[PDB]
Amino acid sequence: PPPPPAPQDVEMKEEAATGGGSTGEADGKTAAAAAEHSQRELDTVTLEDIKEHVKQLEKAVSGKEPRFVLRALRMLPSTSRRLNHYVLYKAVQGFFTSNNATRDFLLPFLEEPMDTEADLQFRPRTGKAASTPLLPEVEAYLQLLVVIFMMNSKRYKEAQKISDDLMQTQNRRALDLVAAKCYYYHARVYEFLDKLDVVRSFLHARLRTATLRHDADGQATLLNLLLRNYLHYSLYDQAEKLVSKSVFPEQANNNEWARYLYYTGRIKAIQLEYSEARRTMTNALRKAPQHTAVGFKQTVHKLLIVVELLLGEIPDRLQFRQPSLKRSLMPYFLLTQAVRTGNLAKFNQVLDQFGEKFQADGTYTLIIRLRHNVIKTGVRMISLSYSRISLADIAQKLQLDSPEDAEFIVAKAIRDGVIEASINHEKGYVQSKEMIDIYSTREPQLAFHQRISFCLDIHNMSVKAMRF
Amino acid sequence: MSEKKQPVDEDNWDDDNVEDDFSNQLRAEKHGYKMETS
Amino acid sequence: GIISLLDEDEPQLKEFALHKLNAVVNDFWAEISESVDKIEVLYEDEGFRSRQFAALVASKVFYHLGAFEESLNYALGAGDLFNVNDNSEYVETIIAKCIDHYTKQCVENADLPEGEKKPIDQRLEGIVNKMFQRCLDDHKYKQAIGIALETR
Amino acid sequence: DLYSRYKKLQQELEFLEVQEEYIKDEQKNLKKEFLHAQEEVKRIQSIPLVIGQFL
């Protein structure tokens, strides 16, 4: 009863801003987005995700959600007296007896701000009234009398889709900002039990309705939902992105775009790619927003640089290593050691030692080409090393035992185009060369057009950012 | 932030990356025994 | 892969393909984008008497891919069941762009003295004189004179 | 009024965009003038520089 005043304070600090302030920031505002309380409220949703939200236990049971959802009314200027009601109900938790009125009694509590009066006209108060109670209910998924209620609370959020689609006005720059979060929690609670089936068409038509009339933070986030949907399950509709690539917003949330490029980097990694996939993995890597969230870059980075492992030109990756990730990369450290080593028995004994964590990865694409990566590491090293090597030297240095499969190796390496190396054809016996004096002057200034044209692009972008 | 699925999850340390790069070359006599091999 | 099941050169398996279309076209939005060419084959074929539905799912998949002038072409090619719909995304955005073409066409032909115009394609004027009667018999004539603005 | 208020939204945006344009050519003109000023700053001077002393 002395700690629940801290949810009592932060609860009023949240819906003061949200209800009164963003309702006044919805009345006449939003020239581009003057709803700064929307980003303030998403900051407070991250604040309720740091802390306990409001009333999970808090030394009592079920105090705020029966309390504050009453009597908003939006009327004559003595509705700060309804705020005074909200404030002076707080003798119940400290003084009186707390009673259980959440997760069961919420079904008319959500209908209370509609059945008081014709409160107001805008939907962000309705999204408030169905989000700010019900998002404090989702992160307790103990699957007993709590997850069927997340299910029904997000059925009320599907009614919030209905009252997002037929609400009379660019309130989507608040409701899609909240709906990004809560539709991720939709996908979470729906897939804590089974794969979601008609929620796919929910998501399809929800992407459809956000097409042009209000195309603001909805398309990219629902596309992240759709992408991770097609990622977690069988892989049939990546041709949909190959035919309907409409994936380019303002890239607003500045981390949504980062992890979006990460997820589609995993896509192009699993389709087939080295180059474009590793460069968008690199751009998402350097577009890591901060390290203010403990060890969340780490597992996702273990799966990020799988393609760089598949390059073969990677050293040990240890600068990323969280020490709490060490006990999980007990396979992965020896795996990049098996990348640095050319042993074959160790190449399959790391697999024979860690196939279960390789299934935890669940990417066969790595081991279906990692032997080929070992022989390409060999050919890159030794073909960069010597001018006129023999195929027998490298062959029976890497246990090939015959000339003709070394010929097929050198031939498919010419076909893969690393070095000039040809064969002094009598019985093999490579006659070859390196390549210095290739070119060095007009060829840099070919790329310097892209250098400085990229620089002047960022000049004009800083100009259009200086405009703000 | 880490709002993704991932929430599911110098003494020699400086010279250690080179050490694992040194983990494939005669870790530390046959160098010196090669003198008398010829 | 639902279009390789069309080697039977009559419309009588094109109809089973369309019975697959109006079932799972939103899932198979990835699939029809390659099949644009055979949807063109269906529109060009006058013996394909369901060419109305060919232009229907053509404007559907082009509404998906973001084609809009060809959505207008095959929106006119869609037929008489095109304008009559009361749906809230598809039909009203594409008749929005269609009667937007009607008013910019009546501006350009109002900028074109005495004929030599682009003629009325045979599936215009439908919701013009049908939603116009909604505007008239809803007894507020401000849209009924707003079209008179928009046509010059 | 969808056939009046909405339409009336262009009754002034044309002059709006025209002045938004003219601000650019006037940026150009004022830049010309500023270059003229900077020119006239030091062209007669610094040749017969007499010497005193600050006090």
Name the experimental technique: cryo-EM
Q: How far apart are CA A158 and CA C23, in angstroms?
A: 23
Cβ contact, residue pair C30, A237, below 8 Å:
yes
Distance from CA of C135 to the nearest CA of D (A): 12
Place of tokens 């990049």: A336
- The residue length of chain A stands at 468
Q: At what angle do helices A172-190 and A36-50 cross, to 10 degrees?
A: 30
Distance CA A358, CA A369 (A): 14
CA separation, residue A172 to residues A175, A251, A347, C21 (Å): 5, 16, 53, 31
Q: Are strands A430-431 and A422-423 parallel, antiparallel or unpaired?
A: antiparallel
Q: Which two tokens stand for residue C28?
A: 């198979």
Nearest to C71 by CA among C59, C89, C85: C59
- C-alpha torsion sign, points A169, A172, A173, A175: positive
Taking every pair of Cα atoms in chain D, the longest distance, rounded to a whole number of angstroms, is: 77
List residues of B whose CB lies inside 8 A of any A CB: 1-9, 16-17, 20-21, 23-24
- For residue C126, the 8-state DSSP code is H
Q: What φ, ψ does residue A219 adopt, rounded to 5°?
A: -65, -45
Query: Which residues does residue A431 pair with via DSSP β-bridges, in sequence order?
Result: A422
Cβ–Cβ < 8 Å for A147, A192: yes
CB contact under 8 A, A297 and B6: yes
Distance of CA A164 to the CA centre of its chain: 24
Residue B11 DSSP symbol: T
Tokens 């209000």 belong to which residue?
A: A214
Maximum Cα–Cα distance across chain B: 66
* 3-state secondary structure (DSSP) of residue B16: helix
- Would you mind telling me the total number of residues written for chain C in this entry? 152
DSSP state of C85: -
List of residues 6+ apart from C118 with CB closer than 8 A: C105, C109
In chain A, the residue whose alpha carbon lies closest to the alpha carbon of C35 is: A243
Separation CA A190–CA A202 (nearest Å): 12
CA angle, residues A257, A263, A267, in degrees to nearest 5:
135
Q: Which residues contact A79 (CB under 8 A, 6 or more apart)?
A: A72, A73
C30, C89, C93 ranked by CB distance to A240: nearest: C30
Does residue B26 come out as left (phi exceeding 0), alpha (psi in the -120 to 50 range) or beta? left
CA distance linking residue A433 with residue C10, whole number of Å = 62
Rounded CA gap, A35 and A21, in Å? 9
Beta bridge partners of A430: A423
Q: D54 by DSSP, 3-state: which?
A: coil
Q: Contact B24/A340 with Cβ under 8 angstroms?
A: yes
**Dihedral angle at the C-alpha atoms of A155, A159, A164, A165, nearest 10 degrees?**
110
CA–CA separation, A177 vs A286, rounded Å?
A: 25
State the burial class of residue A363 (Cβ atoms within 10 Å of its Cβ: 0-12, 13-18, 19+).
middle
The gap between the terminal CA atoms of chain B, to the nearest Å, is 64
Q: Where are the beta strands (DSSP E) in chain D?
A: none
Kind and range of the H or E run holding C151? helix C142-151
Cβ count within 10 A of residue A393: 14
What is the least distance, in Å, from the CA of D15 to any CA of chain C? 22
Cα–Cα distance for residue pair A29/A25, rounded to 1 Å: 5
Token pair of A9 as six digits: 């304070």
What distance in Å separates the CA atoms of residue A256 and residue A223, rounded to the nearest whole number? 11
C150 Cβ partners below 8 Å, 6+ apart?
C102, C103, C106
Provide CB contacts within 8 A for A383, sequence distance 6+: A389, A413, A418, A419, A421, A432
How far from the centroid of its chain's Cα atoms is residue A428's Cα? 51
SS (H, E, C) chain A: CCCCHHHHHHHHHHHHHHHHHHHHHHHCCCCCCCCHHHHHHHHHHHHHHHCCCCCCCCCCCCCCHHHHCCCCCCCCCCCHHHHHHHHHCCHHHHCCCCCCCCCCCHHHHCCHHHHCCCCCCCCHHHHHHHHCCCHHHCCCCCCCCCHHHHHHHHHHHHHHHHHHHCCCCCCHHHHHHHHHHHHHHHHHHHCCCCCCCCHHHHHHHHHHHCCCCCCCCCHHHHHHHHHHHHHHCCCCCCHHHHHCCCCCCCCCCCCHHHHHHHHHHHHHHHHCCCHHHHHHHHHHHHCCCCCCCCCHHHHHHHCCCHHHHCCCCCCCCHHHCCCCCHHHHCCHHHHHHHHHCCCHHHHHHHHHHHHHHHHHHCCCHHHHHHHHHHHHHHHHHHHHHCCCCCHHHHHCCCCCCCHHHHHHHHHHHHHCCCCCCEECCCCCCEECCCCCCCCCCHHHHHHHHHHHHHHHHHHHHHHHHHCC
**Residue that has been written with the tokens 């509705």 in this structure:** A79
Residue D3 distance to chain C (closest CA, Å): 5
User: Do A117 and A123 contact (CB within 8 A), yes or no?
Assistant: no
DSSP-based three-state secondary structure for C138: coil
Buried b (16+ CB within 10 A) or exposed e, A180-208: bbbbbbbbbbbeeeeebeebbebbbebbb
Using CA atoms, how far apart are residues A41 and C56, in angstroms rounded to an integer?
44
Using a CB–CB cut-off of 8 Å, the residues of A that contact B are 46, 49, 181, 184, 228, 255, 259, 289-290, 292-300, 315-316, 318, 325, 328, 337, 340-341
**d(C-alpha A238, C-alpha A5), whole Å:** 50
In whole angstroms, what is the distance from residue A99 CA to residue A109 CA?
15
Cα–Cα distance for residue pair A160/C55, rounded to 1 Å: 34
* Residue A59 structure tokens: 């030394």
- Counting one residue from chain A and one from chain B, the pairs whose CB atoms sit within 8 A come to 48
Distance of alpha carbon C105 from its chain centroid, rounded? Answer: 17
**DSSP 8-state assignment for residue C51:** H
The set of residues, in sequence order, having a beta carbon less than 8 Å from that of A335 and lying 6+ positions away, is A309, A350, A354
Long-range contacts of A427-436 (CB under 8 A, 24+ apart): A427/A403, A428/A390, A428/A391, A428/A392, A428/A403, A428/A404, A429/A390, A429/A391, A429/A392, A430/A388, A430/A389, A430/A390, A430/A391, A431/A388, A432/A383, A432/A387, A432/A388, A432/A389, A433/A387, A433/A388, A434/A384, A434/A386, A434/A387
Nearest chain A Cα distance for residue C65, angstroms: 5
